[PDB]
């Protein structure tokens, strides 16, 4: 007996550049009758077959969770480009597993805007697959420095989300869950 259907059933995720991650082992899950609650706007696969794992065992099963905007849905894919895929959370080219999301505008779009969830609009370079630069450094867009102040070409790196409910779907808050794996060379833990 193992409790998988937990975090998406939970209420408030982390902002996308602050993506919460769970390592799961010593477990056993239902990958189908939870999928067959297929009210997820988006679901498609890059590692293994869709829901044919229910008798398959793993070393590591991973589940990062965050909230993006609706347009920002497209990004959570091996080989993607943009302030979400480059600066916030990169999926590798060798990605093993899949992703689910659903419209949380119902839940996580506060009337003045969920000014809580945020993303890193700005990084010097681009983060590696599975990287989380939760840095507040006042990004130097311009040559003259910031020293820790906001100002011209000296901007706060993380832009807020401001999920007003009226938004186009592009900006309704989609609650996202990734399923990586590092099943190799350890006990048979997750089936």
């Amino acid at each position: 007996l193992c409790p998988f259907g937990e975090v998406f059933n939970a209420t408030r995720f982390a902002s996308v550049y602050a993506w919460n991650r769970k390592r799961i082992s010593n477990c056993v899950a239902d990958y189908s009758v939870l999928y067959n609650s297929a009210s997820f706007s988006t679901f498609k696969c890059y590692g293994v077959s869709p829901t044919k794992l229910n008798d398959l065992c793993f070393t590591n099963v991973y589940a990062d969770s965050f909230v993006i905007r609706g347009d920002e849905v497209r990004q959570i894919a091996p080989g993607q480009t943009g302030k979400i895929a480059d600066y916030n959370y990169k999926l590798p080219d060798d990605f093993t597993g899949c992703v689910i999301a659903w419209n949380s505008n119902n839940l996580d779009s506060k009337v003045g805007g969920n000014y809580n969830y945020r993303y890193r609009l700005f990084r010097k370079s681009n983060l590696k697959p599975f990287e989380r630069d939760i840095s507040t450094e006042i990004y130097q867009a311009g040559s003259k420095p910031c020293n820790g102040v906001e100002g011209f070409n000296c901007y706060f790196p993380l832009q807020s989300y401001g999920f007003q409910p009226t938004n186009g779907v592009g900006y309704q808050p989609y609650r996202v869950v990734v399923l990586s794996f590092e099943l190799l060379h350890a006990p048979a833990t997750v089936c």
Partner: antibody
Amino acid sequence: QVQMVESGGGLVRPGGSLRLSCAASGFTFSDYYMSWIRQAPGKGLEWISYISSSGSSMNYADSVKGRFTISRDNAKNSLFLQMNSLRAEDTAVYYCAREFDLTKIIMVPPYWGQGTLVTVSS
Amino acid sequence: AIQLTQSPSSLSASVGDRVTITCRASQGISSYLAWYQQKPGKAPKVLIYAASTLQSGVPSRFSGSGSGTDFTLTISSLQPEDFATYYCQQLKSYPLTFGGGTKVEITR
């Protein structure tokens, strides 16, 4: 056609609270670092606070720190002020300005709405 | 925390003279500076931004000058409507600051 509109001045008893409003259009509002300014009648003008493009970051000038409230609505092109525990010296004419455009990196000529009179007396 | 040396504080000019405003600065702000004219009570308006560039529709008589910390605003031939009070603004760090205010006159 760059436009900005202050509205929401008048009388307020000191220790009571007021709320300002800066409706905008003509530019793209959600791009700009917004900010307010006040001028004591005849006296020098004083920046009081700002707000990020995304509302992700703001800060008040010290003369009003905490007591007042920056806020912007990205989808109705409006900046706001909530003014509380007011004072007879908070009395000024309260401008708003459109300053910093992340859509570029170059200098934007800030746009000032026409202002609005707040006078705190009982 | 960048304070501005608005120089001078008051003046009066015969109609159509050249006048010049210094704005020295407590920091090195680079070219992060705008210049504003305030007809009595009205809102201010930009006249020079990027410390040198003219705003749209403005006449040419206003000349933007400066770099680093010393900044100059030139008027070519002063005009009877250019009666105003004037303010330069630092634009580098967000503590957002002005000059004390050059009140400016016409000698008719």
